[PDB]
Amino acid sequence: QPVIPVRNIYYMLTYAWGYANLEAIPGNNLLDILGYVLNKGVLQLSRRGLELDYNPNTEIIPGIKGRIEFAKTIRGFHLNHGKTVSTFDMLNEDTLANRIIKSTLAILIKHEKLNSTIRDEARSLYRKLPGISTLHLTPQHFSYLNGGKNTRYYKFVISVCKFIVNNSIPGQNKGHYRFYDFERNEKEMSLLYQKFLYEFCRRELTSANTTRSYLKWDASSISDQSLNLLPRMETDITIRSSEKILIVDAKYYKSIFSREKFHSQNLYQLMNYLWSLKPENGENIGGLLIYPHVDTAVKHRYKINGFDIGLCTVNLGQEWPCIHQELLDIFDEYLK
């Protein structure tokens, strides 16, 4: 049951969310890394200052604050017992975003398997936020925050918070929590990898233009113009440049990690994308299959059906910069 070293995994999330030294922490397992990110990450926000959103408050007070609501005032007859119904703007850190952080920290502490230092430091931080109210978190709360009025920095940790909550399982005890075995399932690993490249290519490949492209079948049907029964076909990524276009399909498989038979089932999808796609520029058409491997990286090229296609792998577990170097070396060959 061999898997990727965990420290490298965190980098892939960075590109996945589109936005530090990990050598310092001695805990190989993921939650030690991610918990340290949040626990240290919170400190950066607090130094500059946490988000303060004016929440209006309509309450019954012994005096005038802001705007009096005449209707509620007389109806409750609060004038006689020296009270008014007035609307005013308390400035708090009680926003939905900040509550998530504090509620999240409870889960992080409650996790049964964790570094002692990480749990200790956060509990002070949990104590350091008295005004904010704890919450019982659901994805719908994170869903509400897609507006992103908050800064770019806030969205980073919240994206992490989204990862932790979904990847948290109750363990031995009713109260405490246990971390998900993220590594073992390919599907979430796969969706990460596809998302990892798509946002990554925008960053580094400034030379080329990169977009996900929807394609429509060349078919015509007497029955239906819809062709609803036909499969929806949406590229993982297309990375177009003036001299050559290139479509890529990448996935994480466990069998391919083994150095025997080879899993290239996704290739069946790839060719069909090439065929229905017709280039107006007509510069060239190229294809790529890239998969994760652990030990070493091997690159091949093919001339299959009049198309120039490459199958390649990357030596995950090597080093993050050389891996970053490795992709730029890779794409340059085929992007030509």
Partner: protein, 285 residues
């Protein structure tokens, strides 16, 4: 008030011992188990007389306040006048007749905030701190000398609905004082069957009806964390609607299944309607 009560003798007898001591009981349970009915009849039992006058009933809601409950200043034609509440007035009758037992019925107590409502008085209504010794002047009292003291005669009944998913945590201030009691649906009980057999219901339809609902009630209790045990359906639907002497049969039942039970399942099972169809079929099929 005890001729045909579907609930077992144990709880209703246990309550009588519990209430005589603690004086602050919460009766939990699904809606449609006669939470008002059992307590209303029990109210007569503790008194021993089937008399309504001593008994009073109020339904709490989020905006129910100290003004309605106890004392408020509603206006007369020209100027403001202090107006007695329900509980405030309620005690004045009990003070005259300490030998007698006066009983206060509070439906859906969890919904409202007890503190804003009771305020000062929440200390007094606890069984120990009762009588003239614990008397306190009220908030709106112009003169300190006038006081309100809860006599020992008072017995307080609170009804709470378990069914709501929106409920997360019971109020702390509620929990410290009241003695919670769990009311089962009691779909399989002697007196409920004995009531049903007295009406023109054959044993097979009774055995069919009692058994099949038990399977459904068992399902909801089985998934403990997903849904509370108290979510399980009660029996009050089968009581009412037969006043005219109507014979209970499967033809009659299917209306209640569709009319009364179906929305109840619909809210409880909000994820997959096919799962509802699995359970609706067994009721008739």
């Amino acid at each position: 008030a005890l001729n045909d009560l579907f609930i077992p003798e144990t709880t209703i007898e246990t309550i009588l011992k519990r209430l005589t001591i603690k004086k602050n009981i919460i009766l939990q349970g699904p809606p449609g188990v006669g939470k008002t009915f059992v307590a209303r009849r029990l109210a007569y039992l503790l008194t021993g007389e089937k008399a309504p006058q001593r008994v009073n009933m109020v339904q709490f809601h989020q905006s129910y306040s100290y003004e309605d409950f106890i004392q408020g200043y509603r206006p007369n034609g020209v100027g403001f006048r202090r107006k007695d509440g329900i509980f405030y007035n309620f005690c004045q009758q009990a003070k005259e007749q300490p030998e007698k037992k006066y009983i206060f019925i509070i439906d859906e107590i969890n919904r409202a905030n007890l503190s804003k409502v009771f305020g000062e008085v929440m200390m007094l209504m606890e069984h120990d701190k009762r009588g003239e010794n614990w008397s306190v002047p009220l908030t709106y009292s112009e003169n300190d000398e006038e006081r309100f003291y809860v006599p020992e005669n008072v017995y307080i009944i609170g009804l709470m609905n378990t069914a709501d998913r929106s409920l997360a945590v019971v109020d702390y201030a509620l929990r410290r004082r009241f003695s919670f009691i769990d009311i089962e649906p009691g779909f399989d009980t002697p007196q409920f069957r004995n009531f049903l057999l007295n009406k023109k219901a054959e044993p097979s339809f009774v055995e069919s009806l009692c058994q099949k609902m038990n399977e459904l009630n068992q399902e909801i209790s089985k998934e403990a964390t997903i849904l509370g045990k108290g979510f399980r359906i009660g029996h009050s639907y089968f009581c009412c609607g037969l006043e005219d002497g109507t014979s209970p049969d499967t033809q009659w039942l299917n209306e209640i299944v569709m009319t009364d039970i179906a929305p109840l399942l619909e809210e409880y099972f909000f994820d997959d309607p096919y799962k509802q169809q699995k359970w609706t079929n067994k009721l008739l099929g």
